[PDB]
Amino acid sequence: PVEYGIFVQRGATYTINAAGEFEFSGRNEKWDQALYLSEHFPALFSDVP
Amino acid sequence: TVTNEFASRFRTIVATLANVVNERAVQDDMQKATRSCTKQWLRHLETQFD
Amino acid sequence: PVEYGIFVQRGATYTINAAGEFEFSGRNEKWDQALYLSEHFPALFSDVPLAGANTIIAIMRLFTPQGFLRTDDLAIAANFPRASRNPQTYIPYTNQRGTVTNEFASRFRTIVATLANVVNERAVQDDMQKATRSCTKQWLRHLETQFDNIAVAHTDHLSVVYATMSNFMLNFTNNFSGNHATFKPDQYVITSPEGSYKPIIERQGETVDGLTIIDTSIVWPILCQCTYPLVRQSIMEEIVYPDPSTTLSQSLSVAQVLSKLTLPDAFINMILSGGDSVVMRTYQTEAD
Amino acid sequence: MWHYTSINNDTRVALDPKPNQIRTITKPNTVPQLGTDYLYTFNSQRRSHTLRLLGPFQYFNFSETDRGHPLFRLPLKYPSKAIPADELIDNLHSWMRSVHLLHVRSEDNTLRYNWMLGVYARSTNYTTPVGQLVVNAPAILNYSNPQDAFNSVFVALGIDYID
Amino acid sequence: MWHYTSINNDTRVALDPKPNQIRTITKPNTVPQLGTDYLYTFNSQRRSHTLRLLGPFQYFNFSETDRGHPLFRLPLKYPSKAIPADELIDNLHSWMRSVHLLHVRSEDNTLRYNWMLGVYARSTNYTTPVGQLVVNAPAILNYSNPQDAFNSVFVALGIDYIDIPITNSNIFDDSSTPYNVRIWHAPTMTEVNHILALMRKSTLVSTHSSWHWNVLHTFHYRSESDMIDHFAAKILEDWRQKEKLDKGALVEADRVIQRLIPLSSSTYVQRLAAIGALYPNEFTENVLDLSRLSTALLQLSDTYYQHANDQLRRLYRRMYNDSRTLYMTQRHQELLLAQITADPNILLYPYTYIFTTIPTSMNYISNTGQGRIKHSLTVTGATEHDTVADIVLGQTGEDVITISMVEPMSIAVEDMYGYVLDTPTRDIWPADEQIEQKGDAVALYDTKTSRALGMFNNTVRIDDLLSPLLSLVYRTYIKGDTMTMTQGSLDHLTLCAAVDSDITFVGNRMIAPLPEGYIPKPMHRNNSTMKMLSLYVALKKLENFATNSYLMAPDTSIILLGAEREPAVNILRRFNRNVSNVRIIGMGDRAVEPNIRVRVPFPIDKNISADFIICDINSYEDQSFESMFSETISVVTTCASAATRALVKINHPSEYMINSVIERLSQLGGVFYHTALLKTASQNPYSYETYIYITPIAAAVRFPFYSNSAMINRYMTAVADDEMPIIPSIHTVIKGHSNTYSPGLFCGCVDVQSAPLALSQLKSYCSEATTWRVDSDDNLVNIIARIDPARIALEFRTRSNTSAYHEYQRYVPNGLGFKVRKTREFRYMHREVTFIHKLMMYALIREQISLTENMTQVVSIGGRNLADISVVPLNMKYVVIDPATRIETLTQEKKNIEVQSRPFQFDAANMDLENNSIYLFIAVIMNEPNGAATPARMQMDKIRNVATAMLTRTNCVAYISFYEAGIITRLDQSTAHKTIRVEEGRLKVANYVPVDTLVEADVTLMLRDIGITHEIIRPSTPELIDACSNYGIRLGSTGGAVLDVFNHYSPVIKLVR
Amino acid sequence: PMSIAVEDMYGYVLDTPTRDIWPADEQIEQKGDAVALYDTKTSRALGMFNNTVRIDDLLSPLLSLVYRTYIKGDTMTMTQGSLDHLTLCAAVDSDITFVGNRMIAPLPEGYIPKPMHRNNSTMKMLSLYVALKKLENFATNSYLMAPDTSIILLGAEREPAVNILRRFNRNVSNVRIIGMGDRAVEPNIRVRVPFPIDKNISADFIICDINSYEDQSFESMFSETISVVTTCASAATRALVKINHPSEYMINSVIERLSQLGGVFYHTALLKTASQNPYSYETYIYITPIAAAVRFPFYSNSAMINRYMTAVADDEMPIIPSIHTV
Ligand SMILES: C[S@@+](CC[C@H](N)C(=O)[O-])C[C@H]1O[C@@H](n2cnc3c(N)ncnc32)[C@H](O)[C@@H]1O
Predict the structure, then answer these.
(1) Core-most of C209, E77, E349, E798, by most CB within 10 Å?
(2) CB–CB of B10/C115 below 8 Å?
(3) Partner C contacted by D102 (CB < 8 A)
(4) What sections of C49-169 are H helices per DSSP?
(5) What gap in Å lies between CA D120 and CA D59, rounded to an integer?
(6) Looking at CA atoms only, how far is residue E366 from chain F in angstroms?
(7) Could you give the CA distance from residue E966 to residue E1018 in angstroms, rounded to a whole number?
(8) Are the beta carbons of E98 and E71 closer than 8 angstroms?
């Protein structure tokens, strides 16, 4: 739960700017496959420490 | 919990009620056997509730 | 209920820190056997005194063992296999040939002194008739004397059987240090670098034709319907001392079967022991 | 003199102990004292016994197991004379020894126990979702920044609030 | 002194009795006694009963028949009260009579009973083979040569050894034994070498370097933790022994090395032994918490290895690897060679490693007992922190420490009743002067008083200061602890003020005992109550001086005007319950009965009258200055027309207000009234609301008018604030050598390992900083620090960052304190009035030192241990000329300091005054360096010579403090003689001989005949606000009363060229 | 263990200086004796006796008996400020109330106070306090601090002394009793010698009792003890500083230093408390300025000094009491 709270505090999703740096939402939201075709990525697989 | 809080409270309820019926029995000169019987029926309900 | 309240509020279980002081859970929770392999111990068997719940502490102090920690001397002389660096076994009771009174029967009688006062308290609180009280009290005295009878056959005759059996070749692990509060069996595993380890000891659910299920009710026939050679009343049946050769020969048979059993697998694993390997880049740092 | 001057601060966050202190904040070893651990007065005319605990304990939801203690039965030993100090002191020592808050000790210098949440957790015998959240992960009660202390519970439970 | 000296002997063989003694060693006839037969203590907090038997019985294994005895059931007769002696004594007598050891009496003079074997035999009801061996042949227990005593048992039993269980020395702990001893066959040393070499193969086993009865025995542990606790207790014994062996004292201890050798053990034991053999600990007579010992020592390994130089570290690692080795100092081995030379047959643990070198390392401090440390941190040290990381103090709970707004007073009961007046000085009041003061009054009133002075006035409220004292008076009363005080005595008034009930007297000296059935409720005081009481005391003490009883005279009355005067009239009435016919009226708006409720101006028909009138009317606030003037005028008029003696409060004590008041009294009476501006000690410390005593006298009052009086200067030098007052911040992070910080504090907690560094950084800002741990379990050290401007003005003269960090390393971890109890520090701490006076003087000087141009340095003669330094700007060089300032030339050079440790010479010829330098002469003229008082003519010589030396130089400014004579006549009249008191006409500062006082007019006279320019100057209220806010100090109440008179009457002379 | 009267334990015995002047050659002749006696340590026999018959062990049965009569209620009468009262303050770890000036307040019915915890140097510090009140004036019966006065006790582990002193003076108004020294728990300030330069301790009295650091140069112990006496004298009108190594050169250089600081000579005397360890050569030096010039300021061949001077390097290891049987 605590690690969870930190992770979700960073955001449940992210985009990737032109630099290639990840940019997390800061927001918790349920994912939908409507997002598979968009800029957003699930944050769990960011593989960013 | 190891013990249901509801059954515990009912048991304390029958603790109070049983002492009330023992008070009432000794005041009313009742035989010890009939007392043992009401007391046993009370314990019985306590376990059924448990 | 109040005693149990303070008790269970202290914690259903506890562990032992590196300091060695017990630290309780503070949390009611049913024991399950998985916990037996962990750092936890049941709290009733802790024997740490607790204010306001002393009665439970006394009744739990009725559970303390009367035996001793024998060193497995003969088994060491014969070089029988032994997992512990110093083999030891807990005998349930010492021999007491000299005394007018068995110390074991005496202790059981004080146990029934405490238990009988506990049942009288419970009876008077629960408005019971004096006759049924006389009956439970009489049955209690009855057990006290029956124990007085079999106590010799235990302290003087079972104790030896536990000791010779302690020395047998196949009883390789230590079983019990005799202190319930801090005992934990040593837990060896067959670790492998190339796999998950196998504990020797686990709750695998192989009940071994039902063996691992324990009927405590076996105390009733033992106390109250079984004669012993040492207690004649007096036929004086001559004591039997079994030929070592039978148990010895089955022990040895098990051993040789076991080595020969492991052998083919153990051979190939030696042949391939160097065969495990890691992927490795070799970057070059020279012109040629 | 015209402008207001004040040192504003959250007294409740201040009242909350660091996690290592929690094992000893019940003070199992020392006997509780008036004017510090508690204060009790017998309003002689109203024949009422008012007992207010002090320090971190001043905000505390008693478990129903806590109410089964003799210390709460004390007013019913009367009417009417004020409870003698010696009975009150030691009974209070008993119930104070009885409370064992779940927690995780930590070497960090910035943590403080979430006194309210841990007390509320214990008070329900840990069957509330916040209670079992405290049980499976007691370290969650620990916190540095005061606000995130409840936030981490909200996010962990997925709930919009707590009563 | 170099070689160890000791009388080694086996105490256990000594403890064993001769066989005939065994029948009587149970002492069937005589009753057992404490301090001999046994000792028992009830640890009241742990609610545990520890009973240790003494003598031969101290080593005894109880039979299960022995445990069935009532004497062991005794702790269960409780909780909780300690067992009464009489039950314990006789029960112990019963069980001691019960023990009948088997033995054979013998006429030989060399035999001793084998106490251990006989007790162990009995303990098992003689069913052990050693037990039945004792039964069939009891004479075997008897022995001459100590070793053969066990040998004869080994040979007789044919066994290689014997295992004896050990009981707890406390005999009420029926719990599992930690381990058990195993006596071995031995007897040649070689058999022992074999038994040990074999012993390495076992599990949890240890031996002493030498054994009792010269028979090898090895402890075997049930568990590694029991082992750890044993090794710990013995490491501690070896340390306590070595600590005096090094001091060369004779030692009768059983063995030279009391430390255990781990023949087979876990890692924790090996490390405990390694760190144990190094003797890191400093000698310590402080009681230890013996229970936490192992943890403590493990933490010590955790520290010793953590900070030792690499060779020491490698030595501890060697020690940790060869755990079966017994490392020992050369002197120890010399002692062993001595005892082997004496007794060649003796066995000793063979595998030792002698230390050619005793390692060079600091001793660690270790007090595991209660008590927060209060480090007096030094400005510089051996360590040089070139650049330290910021230290973030983790925030504290209020459970571990609280921080109150103000420190409560700690004071004597008589002190609270302590008025300090100021008599008028000027002989006439010319009409222009009235206008010049009228403008100052209208301006100071219409533009209000400083927000900082007002905030201090309303922050340190007097009721909060007095309350713990007044509450303590109450608690001793209700428990019956008080019973003796004289009637009319101030302690009696204080009791009347601490309890809401009548106080009867069975006699003039003895208080009537509190009636058995009830406890009176605490007295309810409002904040102005105690002040009114002190004004009453002031009235009885002004009516006549020598009075011991403050009781009202019979057939006399008194009135107390002002809002909420009810508690004052109640305490006063009940205080005077014994005296006949004592009316005590009350008045004022918002006044409940008994007090009359009336509004100012009083109704025209009403005609109040008494022998006394303590007026205390408050200002209406929302009014014209003309309004407060006419209103206070009519208040004083009514207050004076009714009583021969009066004490009216002035809320706005302008010189114009008070002088117009005396003008008014002369306008009403013809002849002048004898007024004086009183200031009660129970009044709020920062309040400028001084009272004015008023009484007609038959003599004409020469010099009726006030001017520049200290009570008035408290109000006049207060002005409109320039900026919002500093509020005590409580910052946590400790930047290294960073100048920027607010006034306030440094609360926090930090890990013990980073703790010395914390104090090494904390030294930069804080003169001292208290530190402690909650428990031996805690990894953190709580730390509190005031921020003192002086130390900041010392450490910041240069960029250097030296510190005594290496010494602070010794305090980790046990040398930092322990205190489970809450501590309560304050955002405003108490300090003595004179120190505050020096702060106001240093502010009055420092804020002038900044404005001046060109002068390079500050030569402060008399600046003991750099007290003057807060005056000096960081760029300036600083020179002290005090023959009492201890010299570290490294610190002189480090902080740009220079110190001439010679008396300064006051002769004009040898004086070395210099251009462009600021000469401080703060309280130096009053005293010779040895502390003897300087006669006033000699002081005139001092000021004359200094002005004479100053006549011939440019850019020189001197600040010479002097006590004025006019204070004496003040202090002789006032009662508040605490700290500052007149004696034989000479003013006496605390911790000083009384010093003769100069006359001011004579000073200006000599200074004008010298012709040098000069300015009399005294610190003002803004200076007080500056110092008290900047240091975190709060004014004392009696200190607040005495401070205005004490300050205005010690002017500083400011010479300048 | 000692068997002695309670008044006896508080019994100082001074030695006044005799020589009228200190010629420069004499300083060298004594300096060699000092450097030699210091660098080559004092006799192992004198040191062993010094550390064997420890004073706490002697006093303890007396101090323990004072305690046991108290808790059983056997004591109830002693004057305030009397030495028996100080002894009761030292025998019990609790406050001592007085229902009257002559009668002790009865022990509250519900409890027995724990025995007072003294370290070995405690009782010596108490006897030095008694010595200070008895040197300030001779005829005094009550050893209570004067009102509005203060005192400081430097040295390691001075806590029990400050506790017994504070509780002893619980009745007198405004009696500060500060504590100092390394290894000092609160109430005592913990500080190391040399004292920090900013710190400015001050009182009517100063019972310095600082111990030697041992591992140091003779130049070091000389300069350190010099600065200790300097600080001890600049702060108090009356002082009682311990000298761990009382060479004639050390003490005479001390008086030379006090004359160097004050101009006029101080009236020193080498005190030796009865509660001090019997074989210790660590004599104290009382120090107080007086209006009269101090004729014969310097010591020589004083008995307190001779206890240290005639001690020398041991020739052989000291006899240890054997217990032969035949
Ligand atoms: C008033 S005391 C120290 C108090 C000082 N005001 C402070 O802030 O700490 C002055 C000190 O200067 C030294 N002294 C006294 N008379 C002196 C003189 N005539 N010349 C030089 N120093 C003197 C004394 O040692 C004395 O301790």
Answers:
(1) E349
(2) no
(3) yes
(4) 54-61, 73-77, 103-125, 130-152, 159-167
(5) 10
(6) 9
(7) 15
(8) no
Kindly give the residue spans of alpha helices, DSSP state H, lying in F19-104: 24-39, 44-52, 55-71, 83-91
Q: Is the peptide bond before F194 cis (omega within 30 degrees of 0)?
A: yes
Strands E802-803 and E383-384: antiparallel
Which residues on adjacent β-strands are paired with residue E326? E352
Cα–Cα nearest to E530, from E609, E621, E623, E463 = E463
Whether E226 and C182 have beta carbons less than 8 Å apart is answered as no
Place of tokens 């440019």: E954
Distance CA E801, CA E381 (A): 9
Asked whether the beta carbons of residue E1 and residue F202 sit closer than 8 angstroms, the reply is: no
- Three-state SS string across E744-787, please? EECCEEEECCCHHHHHHHHCCCCCCEEEEECCCCCCEEEEEEEC
Eight-state DSSP code of residue D112 = B
From CA C132, how far away is CA D106, in angstroms rounded? 58
Give the burial class of D108: count Cβ atoms within 10 A of its Cβ; 0-12 exposed, 13-18 middle, 19 or more buried.
middle
Contact between D1 and E455 using a beta-carbon 8 Å cutoff:
yes
User: For C121-157, b where at least 16 C-beta lie within 10 A, e where not — what string?
Assistant: eebeeebbeeeeeeeeeeeeeebbeebbbbbbbbbbe
- Residues in Cβ contact with F223 at an 8 Å cutoff, skipping those fewer than 6 apart: none
Task: Supply D124's token pair.
Answer: 């329900």
Tell me if D98 and C2 make a contact (CB, 8 A cut-off).
Answer: no
The Å distance, Cα E864 to ligand 1 centre, comes to 6
Cβ contact E–B (≥3 pairs, < 8 Å): no
Nearest CA to ligand 1 atom 8: E867
Q: How many other C-beta atoms are found inside a 10 Å radius of the C-beta of residue C217? A: 8
Q: Are F264 and F289 in contact (CB under 8 A)?
A: yes
Residue with tokens 């004696």: E983
Rg of chain A over Cα atoms, rounded to whole angstroms, equals 11
- Does the beta carbon of E389 lie inside 6 Å of ligand 1? no
Strand E877-880 vs strand E823-826: parallel, antiparallel, or unpaired? unpaired
Q: Taking Cα atoms as reference points, which of E216, E210, E219 lies closest to residue E263?
A: E219
Cα-atom radius of gyration of chain D, to the nearest Å?
18
Contacts of D66 (CB under 8 A, 6+ apart): D72, D95, D98, D99, D123
Does ligand 1 come within 6 angstroms of the Cβ of E811? no
Q: Which two tokens stand for residue F203?
A: 């009182």
Q: What is the 3-state secondary structure (H, E, C) of E129-151?
A: HHHHHHHHCHHHHCECCCCHHHH
**H or E stretch covering E239:** helix E224-245
Alpha helices by DSSP H, E644-754: 655-669, 710-716
Residue with tokens 């309820």: B13
Cβ–ligand 1 contact at F202 (below 6 Å): no
Ligand 1 pocket residue status of E882, Cβ below 6 Å: yes
Which residues of chain B lie closer than 8 angstroms to D127, CB-CB? 1
Determine which helix (DSSP H) or strand (DSSP E) holds D76, and give its type and residue range: helix D70-77
Chains F and C touch (3+ CB pairs under 8 A): no
Give the H/E segment covering residue F176: strand F175-179
Q: How far apart are CA E860 and CA E871, in angstroms?
A: 10
Q: What tokens were used for D57? A: 């304990």
Structure tokens at E1007: 């200074």
In chain C, the N- to C-terminal Cα span, in Å, equals: 86
Q: How was this structure determined?
A: cryo-EM
Contact of E572 with E533, CB cutoff 8 Å: yes
How many other β-carbons are positioned within 10 Å of the β-carbon of residue E659? 21
Whether the CB of E867 sits within 6 Å of ligand 1: yes
Could you tell me if D103 lies within 8 Å of chain E, comparing CB atoms?
Answer: no
How far apart, in whole angstroms, are the C-alpha atoms of residue D109 and residue E750?
Answer: 6
Find the angle CA(E623)-CA(E626)-CA(E627) to the nearest 5 degrees: 40
Round to whole Å and give the CA distance between E498 and E512. 16
